[PDB]
From a paper:
Glu82 in the active site Loop (RGGREM) is critical for activity, and we mutated this residue to slow catalysis and capture complexes that were not obtained with the wild-type enzyme. The substrate-free state shows Arg81 is the gatekeeper that controls fatty acid entrance to the active site. The specific activity of OhyA(Y201F) was ∼10-fold lower than OhyA, and OhyA(E82A) was a >100-fold less active. The importance of Glu82 in creating the hydronium ion is evidenced from the severely compromised catalytic activity of OhyA(E82A). It is instructive that OhyA(E82A) activity is not zero illustrating that positioning of the buried water by the α7 dipole and the arrival of the protonated substrate carboxyl at the active site also contribute to catalysis.
Author numbering:
A (entry chain A), B (entry chain A): -1 to 60, 71 to 78, 81 to 591
Amino acid sequence: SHMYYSYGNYEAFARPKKPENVENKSAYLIGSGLASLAAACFLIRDGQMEGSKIHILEELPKPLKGYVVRRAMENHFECLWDLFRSIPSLEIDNASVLDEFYWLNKEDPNYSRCRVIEKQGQRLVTDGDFTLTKTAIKEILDLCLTNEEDLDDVKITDVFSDDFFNSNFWIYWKTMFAFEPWHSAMEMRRYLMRFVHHISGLADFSALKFTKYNQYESLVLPMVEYLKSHGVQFEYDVKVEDIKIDVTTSQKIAREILIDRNGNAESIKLTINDLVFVTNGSITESSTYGDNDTPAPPTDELGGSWTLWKNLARQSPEFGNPDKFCQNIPKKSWFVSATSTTNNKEIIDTIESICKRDPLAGKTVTGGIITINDSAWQMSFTINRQQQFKDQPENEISTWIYALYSDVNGDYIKKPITECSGNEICQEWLYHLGVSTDKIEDLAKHASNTIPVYMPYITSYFMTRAIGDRPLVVPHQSQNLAFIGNFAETERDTVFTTEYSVRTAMEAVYQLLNIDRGIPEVINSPFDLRVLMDAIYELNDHQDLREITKDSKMQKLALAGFLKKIKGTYIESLLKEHKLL
Amino acid sequence: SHMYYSYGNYEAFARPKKPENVENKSAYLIGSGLASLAAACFLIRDGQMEGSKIHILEELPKPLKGYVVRRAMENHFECLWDLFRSIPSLEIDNASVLDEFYWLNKEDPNYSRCRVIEKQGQRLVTDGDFTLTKTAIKEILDLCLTNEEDLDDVKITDVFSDDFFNSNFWIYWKTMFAFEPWHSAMEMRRYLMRFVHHISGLADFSALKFTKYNQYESLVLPMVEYLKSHGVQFEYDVKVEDIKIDVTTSQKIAREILIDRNGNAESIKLTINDLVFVTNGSITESSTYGDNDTPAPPTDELGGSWTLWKNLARQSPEFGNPDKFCQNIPKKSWFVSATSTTNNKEIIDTIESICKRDPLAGKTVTGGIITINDSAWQMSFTINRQQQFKDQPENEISTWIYALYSDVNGDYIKKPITECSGNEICQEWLYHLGVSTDKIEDLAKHASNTIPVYMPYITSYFMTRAIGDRPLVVPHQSQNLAFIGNFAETERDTVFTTEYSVRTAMEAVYQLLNIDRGIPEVINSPFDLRVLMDAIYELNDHQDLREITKDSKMQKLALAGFLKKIKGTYIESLLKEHKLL
């Protein structure tokens, strides 16, 4: 391809030459999403493009009656870090967003003290172990051994059986990633191989890393200062309708950008030197907002994002199939998310007794999400390093809440979550905290300002896709078109991840300009001996190779002959090295 | 330990905090070798130490009747690149030594057009294939499967048999690395695992990378400008005798540095805050020099380096056993190296017709070493990107020559190489180039200025060592002592390598100061599925799994059952992925 993957320090520290003919090129970026911001940043640094020639078109210009909170990173987001190492931070002087992040998660590491709760406040008894049976472990192995071509339109409830589902591993997995039974077995197979190196840190969120303030403040805003420092243009109130593309038998050239600047109908014309970066699709689209007194109105609208993707699919199949992601989303699926802000010391005291940490402390609180396992909504909540907003009073905590089931009645508020307001969500949440039934309706109506948010497309990432549903970053024979974001296709990496946004960003800029530098490959942990032995030891709840085959005569007979061969050699020393012998 | 290994972009780009209490610390560096220069550089950048407090003691101050040339790098010298990414180059403005190196080897890649020659000029017939038989491949596998503890004082002629030795693979291996039959099987086992990822590029030197000018100009001098830019002290004509060390049952503290500054006998006293970095041993020690008319006088002296290592061994076994490296070196071993500089167009024309490239071109010439396979001295030569010296006339080429056998008579100059002058070496070399017997004595005596160099310790790196012969970088319970260089011990990495000098440099600075940053691990290619399948395909001269077992009924029967299991799964698709099915 116009590209090559690499995996070294040689490729990482090196600076690529200024790409040929970039002194006569312009680039247009569709949407102000985090992927576009990264693609524009890559055009500045590595592509050495002019700042006066990078245009970012957004529908938004410059209300809301409360605070709203919008997952964590991990060390091996290899493309996210090549970017923020070059982004000067907004807090600590002469140190990059990486540096401030790097130090902050070393000074205050992340770990969950109470990961799962049940029975209205109590800590889950088997919290820690995976409760994976011999059958469940095998279906995990078979799914990874299953080729990805043999997973077209294959749901998760077709690869696993009961043994896997009634386990803590499924509880830990579906809740930190927001997976659904009817979701793509193709993507979960990617997630299993993607994060096989932190599988020990799955039960306790030890391999997670959070920023200081919220995603806007710590990630988006440092980028925006970097971009405007270089003169990058920010077009506001620009809605993109369609993009005329010439798909000849030889090329694919973009020509027009049919926009609606505020109210006027205009159009930008593109040569072959005018690059276009389309963030096709959006999970944040068509989100409604409620308050502490009214539910967020449920909607199913097609926003300008999907209609933009739709208008390109009717121009070539190679530009993707949007309908598999935004149509036929089960009405049970995740739609509602909430944010309860409160200073009432009795709710913060209740949270303290569960998560074992002072929430009003500036340190870690929950360590991640805390899953109410027996809750009807299958609802989870998290509390990050308060205050999460830079100008929020230093005696308030902001709690993010979501639920995976949206058409079942709550155990206390006997109705679906799409029918509930802020205080009705706040009431069902507090009841599961163990708060007394007497102080439930008051502490939610008058003490906590809970904001519910309905997004009809939040699970569009994980829909059951097929080979060809997601478009390539740079389609075959394309000259100035690129698709970025989590509905673009690349190799092995996982969507619903800020890494995926910066991956397809860095792959789009590097291909269209042919930059003489390698792109960091998805970490090779799934092909690493040492990482895979660790997975077998951790999947079996810390059992050596003898204890795993002590009840199988057909297995313990094959192992005994295996140990005879590798006895006294590197393999046997590598097997005690990773606790397997 | 005081340390942790890491393998990511997260750890690579990040800057570590200023180590505690470094504002009251001093460091002393023993010798001006490349390892010390790196340790001092690491004290400046990562340790944030003062420049006025880094002392580099050297025996040399500020003749020689000719030019002298002193191996190549590879992409996965993970510690060498964390260093030069921060070293400003001396040629291209505002670009580091890494950058100028990175671009230079992309603009002009390296590859050997004629790797082995024989029969006085002709190209070897089987050049390319490994000629590894089924037995030879297995001894390779067994040696790696052999634990490293089971290799104490084990020579190379005890792990391999005849089948391995009469092969091109042995010819390619012993000559680019300067291995000997009687050398350590422990280190070759490390070399096999170290470079298992470039095994395809072993026959053609395609994975090699050279600098522009010589090692002094392109590596040492950029470092020295960086160090003196920060005020690092350079003590010249300082010979270090002994270093008094307090090895109590609890600690190991250095106290005195017994030196001989020029002629005076002085001594520096060390608190626990005065760090010491000892480059224990030296292959360059006690080197004599000849000219085009007289042989370099053979010597066996103990230089101030070995006597310094000796004086520390009589203070603790944990500081190493120097005698295994500098005593009992076989008199057949490599000692003589040469450098033939000439402008005579008939010698450069002869080289052109063999290496297939214009030597007087500024590009690649030989691509690496060219081995004269049937030569008595087992002599090899290389010609790098002339001119290799910054102020050398643009019509001269400088040819480096060495030989592995030093007590056998040459095929033309019927005497050992330790008896030969510059022109006698130049005559034996030209005879093997195919130059006519008539124009052999003239073109070497009057056309070429060949300088012979005798170093009695060049093969000290690869001597048959045992666990405990090489000291740890930071011995147990040590407080201010560190041993750097290729006679220090670390994990998995290989000596006789500029990576090893910068590895133990970066490990010494990071442990003594406890820097909050990981050290890049030796590349995990020997534990990488994809890299190991590639090795089996490349070791068998590009044969798939069917052709490797077509003559073994006990093997083809086990494979047929193996292919039944993994059929249609990831493993089988990964096996065509790497040409194995």
